[PDB]
mmCIF file of all heavy atoms in Angstrom:
data_model
loop_
_atom_site.group_PDB
_atom_site.id
_atom_site.type_symbol
_atom_site.label_atom_id
_atom_site.label_comp_id
_atom_site.label_asym_id
_atom_site.label_seq_id
_atom_site.Cartn_x
_atom_site.Cartn_y
_atom_site.Cartn_z
ATOM 1 N N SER A 11 57.254 -48.917 27.586
ATOM 2 C CA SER A 11 56.595 -47.753 27.098
ATOM 3 C C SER A 11 55.033 -48.160 27.474
ATOM 4 O O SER A 11 54.467 -49.144 27.245
ATOM 5 C CB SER A 11 56.618 -47.461 25.676
ATOM 6 O OG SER A 11 56.271 -46.062 25.590
ATOM 7 N N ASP A 12 54.449 -47.116 28.209
ATOM 8 C CA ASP A 12 53.017 -47.236 28.509
ATOM 9 C C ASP A 12 52.137 -47.202 27.291
ATOM 10 O O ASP A 12 51.882 -46.116 26.820
ATOM 11 C CB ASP A 12 52.564 -46.156 29.563
ATOM 12 C CG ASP A 12 53.326 -46.466 30.950
ATOM 13 O OD1 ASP A 12 54.488 -46.140 30.818
ATOM 14 O OD2 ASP A 12 52.676 -46.982 31.841
ATOM 15 N N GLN A 13 51.596 -48.380 26.990
ATOM 16 C CA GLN A 13 50.802 -48.557 25.875
ATOM 17 C C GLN A 13 50.392 -50.019 25.787
ATOM 18 O O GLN A 13 49.392 -50.336 25.253
ATOM 19 C CB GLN A 13 51.424 -48.267 24.452
ATOM 20 C CG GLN A 13 50.523 -47.963 23.376
ATOM 21 C CD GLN A 13 51.321 -47.548 22.094
ATOM 22 O OE1 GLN A 13 52.370 -48.119 21.752
ATOM 23 N NE2 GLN A 13 50.660 -46.614 21.282
ATOM 24 N N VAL A 14 51.140 -50.879 26.640
ATOM 25 C CA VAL A 14 50.876 -52.192 26.972
ATOM 26 C C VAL A 14 51.343 -52.396 28.387
ATOM 27 O O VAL A 14 51.983 -51.724 29.053
ATOM 28 C CB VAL A 14 51.520 -53.138 26.054
ATOM 29 C CG1 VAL A 14 50.917 -53.156 24.637
ATOM 30 C CG2 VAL A 14 53.055 -52.696 26.089
ATOM 31 N N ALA A 15 50.812 -53.521 28.833
ATOM 32 C CA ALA A 15 50.972 -54.058 30.150
ATOM 33 C C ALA A 15 52.148 -54.973 30.183
ATOM 34 O O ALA A 15 52.531 -55.365 29.035
ATOM 35 C CB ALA A 15 49.813 -54.853 30.798
ATOM 36 N N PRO A 16 52.827 -55.377 31.263
ATOM 37 C CA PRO A 16 54.056 -56.298 31.343
ATOM 38 C C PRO A 16 53.588 -57.668 30.939
ATOM 39 O O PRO A 16 54.416 -58.543 30.587
ATOM 40 C CB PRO A 16 54.370 -56.254 32.804
ATOM 41 C CG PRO A 16 53.957 -54.821 33.274
ATOM 42 C CD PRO A 16 52.689 -54.662 32.500
ATOM 43 N N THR A 17 52.202 -57.945 30.898
ATOM 44 C CA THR A 17 51.550 -59.203 30.642
ATOM 45 C C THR A 17 51.659 -59.616 29.099
ATOM 46 O O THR A 17 51.907 -60.663 28.857
ATOM 47 C CB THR A 17 49.998 -59.342 30.957
ATOM 48 O OG1 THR A 17 49.275 -58.277 30.240
ATOM 49 C CG2 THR A 17 49.932 -59.132 32.511
ATOM 50 N N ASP A 18 51.618 -58.525 28.212
ATOM 51 C CA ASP A 18 51.681 -58.662 26.763
ATOM 52 C C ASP A 18 52.994 -59.198 26.369
ATOM 53 O O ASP A 18 52.972 -60.073 25.418
ATOM 54 C CB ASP A 18 51.386 -57.191 26.268
ATOM 55 C CG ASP A 18 49.963 -56.778 26.589
ATOM 56 O OD1 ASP A 18 48.944 -57.114 25.860
ATOM 57 O OD2 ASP A 18 49.800 -56.046 27.605
ATOM 58 N N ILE A 19 54.212 -58.849 26.835
ATOM 59 C CA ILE A 19 55.538 -59.241 26.565
ATOM 60 C C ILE A 19 55.669 -60.595 27.436
ATOM 61 O O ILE A 19 55.088 -60.628 28.633
ATOM 62 C CB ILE A 19 56.821 -58.411 27.024
ATOM 63 C CG1 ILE A 19 56.671 -56.933 26.662
ATOM 64 C CG2 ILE A 19 58.071 -58.990 26.493
ATOM 65 C CD1 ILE A 19 55.707 -56.122 27.578
ATOM 66 N N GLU A 20 56.171 -61.781 26.751
ATOM 67 C CA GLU A 20 56.189 -63.005 27.634
ATOM 68 C C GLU A 20 57.475 -63.655 27.090
ATOM 69 O O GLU A 20 58.185 -63.345 26.074
ATOM 70 C CB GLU A 20 55.094 -63.951 27.056
ATOM 71 C CG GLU A 20 53.685 -63.427 27.037
ATOM 72 C CD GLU A 20 52.902 -64.400 26.108
ATOM 73 O OE1 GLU A 20 52.890 -65.605 26.373
ATOM 74 O OE2 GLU A 20 52.173 -63.876 25.126
ATOM 75 N N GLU A 21 58.078 -64.537 28.018
ATOM 76 C CA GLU A 21 59.367 -65.084 27.871
ATOM 77 C C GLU A 21 59.366 -66.040 26.703
ATOM 78 O O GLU A 21 58.428 -66.787 26.596
ATOM 79 C CB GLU A 21 59.861 -66.010 28.978
ATOM 80 C CG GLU A 21 59.538 -65.405 30.375
ATOM 81 C CD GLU A 21 59.780 -66.266 31.626
ATOM 82 O OE1 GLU A 21 60.418 -67.282 31.409
ATOM 83 O OE2 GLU A 21 59.271 -65.965 32.619
ATOM 84 N N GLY A 22 60.328 -65.848 25.774
ATOM 85 C CA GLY A 22 60.480 -66.514 24.483
ATOM 86 C C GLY A 22 59.856 -65.886 23.338
ATOM 87 O O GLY A 22 60.176 -66.087 22.157
ATOM 88 N N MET A 23 58.884 -65.028 23.541
ATOM 89 C CA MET A 23 58.003 -64.351 22.594
ATOM 90 C C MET A 23 58.745 -63.224 21.926
ATOM 91 O O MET A 23 59.573 -62.574 22.485
ATOM 92 C CB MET A 23 56.743 -63.829 23.204
ATOM 93 C CG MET A 23 55.686 -63.288 22.193
ATOM 94 S SD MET A 23 54.212 -62.194 22.736
ATOM 95 C CE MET A 23 53.613 -61.933 21.027
ATOM 96 N N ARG A 24 58.443 -63.005 20.556
ATOM 97 C CA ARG A 24 59.120 -61.964 19.859
ATOM 98 C C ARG A 24 58.528 -60.472 20.220
ATOM 99 O O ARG A 24 57.446 -60.397 20.492
ATOM 100 C CB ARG A 24 58.937 -61.909 18.248
ATOM 101 C CG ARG A 24 59.985 -63.081 17.867
ATOM 102 C CD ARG A 24 59.918 -63.308 16.323
ATOM 103 N NE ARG A 24 60.931 -62.227 15.644
ATOM 104 C CZ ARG A 24 60.730 -62.156 14.276
ATOM 105 N NH1 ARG A 24 59.957 -62.925 13.564
ATOM 106 N NH2 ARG A 24 61.406 -61.042 13.773
ATOM 107 N N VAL A 25 59.444 -59.518 20.348
ATOM 108 C CA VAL A 25 59.139 -58.219 20.938
ATOM 109 C C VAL A 25 59.846 -57.234 20.150
ATOM 110 O O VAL A 25 60.887 -57.509 19.622
ATOM 111 C CB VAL A 25 59.609 -58.449 22.414
ATOM 112 C CG1 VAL A 25 61.239 -58.665 22.459
ATOM 113 C CG2 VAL A 25 59.360 -57.196 23.288
ATOM 114 N N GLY A 26 59.314 -55.900 20.239
ATOM 115 C CA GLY A 26 59.886 -54.775 19.569
ATOM 116 C C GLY A 26 60.504 -53.731 20.542
ATOM 117 O O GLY A 26 59.861 -53.578 21.588
ATOM 118 N N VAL A 27 61.692 -53.199 20.405
ATOM 119 C CA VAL A 27 62.260 -52.324 21.375
ATOM 120 C C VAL A 27 62.779 -51.181 20.516
ATOM 121 O O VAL A 27 63.247 -51.403 19.304
ATOM 122 C CB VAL A 27 63.376 -52.874 22.240
ATOM 123 C CG1 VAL A 27 62.686 -53.875 23.213
ATOM 124 C CG2 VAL A 27 64.495 -53.536 21.378
ATOM 125 N N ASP A 28 63.077 -50.045 20.971
ATOM 126 C CA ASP A 28 63.575 -48.951 20.240
ATOM 127 C C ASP A 28 65.035 -48.914 20.131
ATOM 128 O O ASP A 28 65.575 -49.870 20.735
ATOM 129 C CB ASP A 28 63.280 -47.456 20.881
ATOM 130 C CG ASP A 28 61.776 -47.340 21.346
ATOM 131 O OD1 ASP A 28 60.797 -47.975 20.723
ATOM 132 O OD2 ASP A 28 61.594 -46.515 22.205
ATOM 133 N N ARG A 29 65.596 -48.228 19.291
ATOM 134 C CA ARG A 29 67.140 -48.176 19.265
ATOM 135 C C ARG A 29 67.571 -46.949 19.925
ATOM 136 O O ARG A 29 68.849 -46.944 20.317
ATOM 137 C CB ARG A 29 67.671 -48.224 17.783
ATOM 138 C CG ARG A 29 69.107 -48.735 17.491
ATOM 139 C CD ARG A 29 69.438 -49.002 16.171
ATOM 140 N NE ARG A 29 69.524 -47.640 15.348
ATOM 141 C CZ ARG A 29 70.553 -47.106 14.628
ATOM 142 N NH1 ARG A 29 71.480 -47.879 14.103
ATOM 143 N NH2 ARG A 29 70.431 -45.748 14.221
ATOM 144 N N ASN A 30 66.728 -45.863 20.063
ATOM 145 C CA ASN A 30 67.124 -44.628 20.584
ATOM 146 C C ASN A 30 66.650 -44.473 21.968
ATOM 147 O O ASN A 30 66.860 -43.450 22.474
ATOM 148 C CB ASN A 30 66.469 -43.478 19.767
ATOM 149 C CG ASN A 30 66.839 -43.432 18.406
ATOM 150 O OD1 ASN A 30 67.303 -44.523 17.744
ATOM 151 N ND2 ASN A 30 66.717 -42.350 17.678
ATOM 152 N N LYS A 31 65.981 -45.622 22.416
ATOM 153 C CA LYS A 31 65.312 -45.252 23.662
ATOM 154 C C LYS A 31 64.912 -46.528 24.298
ATOM 155 O O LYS A 31 64.234 -46.516 25.319
ATOM 156 C CB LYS A 31 64.003 -44.407 23.618
ATOM 157 C CG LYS A 31 63.512 -43.549 24.772
ATOM 158 C CD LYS A 31 62.202 -42.711 24.617
ATOM 159 C CE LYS A 31 61.610 -42.371 26.074
ATOM 160 N NZ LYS A 31 60.606 -41.177 25.735
ATOM 161 N N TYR A 32 65.331 -47.674 23.667
ATOM 162 C CA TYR A 32 65.039 -49.133 24.238
ATOM 163 C C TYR A 32 63.764 -49.283 25.055
ATOM 164 O O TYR A 32 63.980 -49.312 26.312
ATOM 165 C CB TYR A 32 66.301 -49.673 24.943
ATOM 166 C CG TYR A 32 67.431 -50.061 24.042
ATOM 167 C CD1 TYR A 32 68.264 -49.145 23.621
ATOM 168 C CD2 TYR A 32 67.423 -51.294 23.409
ATOM 169 C CE1 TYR A 32 69.205 -49.320 22.467
ATOM 170 C CE2 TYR A 32 68.121 -51.569 22.264
ATOM 171 C CZ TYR A 32 69.066 -50.592 21.763
ATOM 172 O OH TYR A 32 69.843 -50.804 20.535
ATOM 173 N N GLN A 33 62.585 -49.485 24.461
ATOM 174 C CA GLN A 33 61.411 -49.747 25.296
ATOM 175 C C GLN A 33 60.347 -50.265 24.385
ATOM 176 O O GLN A 33 60.395 -50.089 23.214
ATOM 177 C CB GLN A 33 60.979 -48.364 26.167
ATOM 178 C CG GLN A 33 60.606 -47.323 25.224
ATOM 179 C CD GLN A 33 60.075 -45.977 25.887
ATOM 180 O OE1 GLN A 33 59.961 -44.892 25.326
ATOM 181 N NE2 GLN A 33 59.700 -46.149 27.256
ATOM 182 N N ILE A 34 59.410 -51.125 25.024
ATOM 183 C CA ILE A 34 58.434 -51.859 24.235
ATOM 184 C C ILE A 34 57.164 -51.051 24.216
ATOM 185 O O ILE A 34 56.652 -50.643 25.121
ATOM 186 C CB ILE A 34 58.293 -53.235 24.682
ATOM 187 C CG1 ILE A 34 57.365 -54.243 23.799
ATOM 188 C CG2 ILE A 34 57.975 -53.417 26.159
ATOM 189 C CD1 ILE A 34 55.842 -54.134 24.150
ATOM 190 N N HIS A 35 56.623 -50.753 23.014
ATOM 191 C CA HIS A 35 55.479 -50.175 22.560
ATOM 192 C C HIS A 35 54.488 -51.258 22.301
ATOM 193 O O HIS A 35 53.415 -51.407 22.968
ATOM 194 C CB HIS A 35 55.665 -49.341 21.448
ATOM 195 C CG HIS A 35 56.574 -48.057 21.629
ATOM 196 N ND1 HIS A 35 57.888 -48.227 21.841
ATOM 197 C CD2 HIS A 35 56.288 -46.815 21.976
ATOM 198 C CE1 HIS A 35 58.331 -46.938 22.276
ATOM 199 N NE2 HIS A 35 57.424 -46.195 22.344
ATOM 200 N N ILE A 36 54.664 -52.019 21.263
ATOM 201 C CA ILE A 36 53.779 -53.272 20.787
ATOM 202 C C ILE A 36 54.768 -54.413 20.591
ATOM 203 O O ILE A 36 55.831 -54.221 20.082
ATOM 204 C CB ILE A 36 53.192 -52.731 19.640
ATOM 205 C CG1 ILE A 36 52.044 -53.648 19.171
ATOM 206 C CG2 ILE A 36 54.093 -52.772 18.321
ATOM 207 C CD1 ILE A 36 50.962 -52.948 18.403
#
């Protein structure tokens, strides 16, 4: 989700995804 860059999410790091629309905000 456009509100962060692909840089912000990093492998092994904890991340939030939606349940209705699966995508990372923060």
Side-chain angles (χ1 to χ4, degrees):
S11 198
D12 297 67
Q13 204 174 34
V14 289
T17 63
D18 296 273
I19 308 77
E20 301 168 53
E21 315 173 15
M23 193 195 172
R24 291 174 83 197
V25 65
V27 292
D28 315 327
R29 200 174 69 136
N30 304 17
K31 209 181 154 160
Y32 285 88
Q33 58 184 167
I34 185 281
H35 299 60
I36 195 151

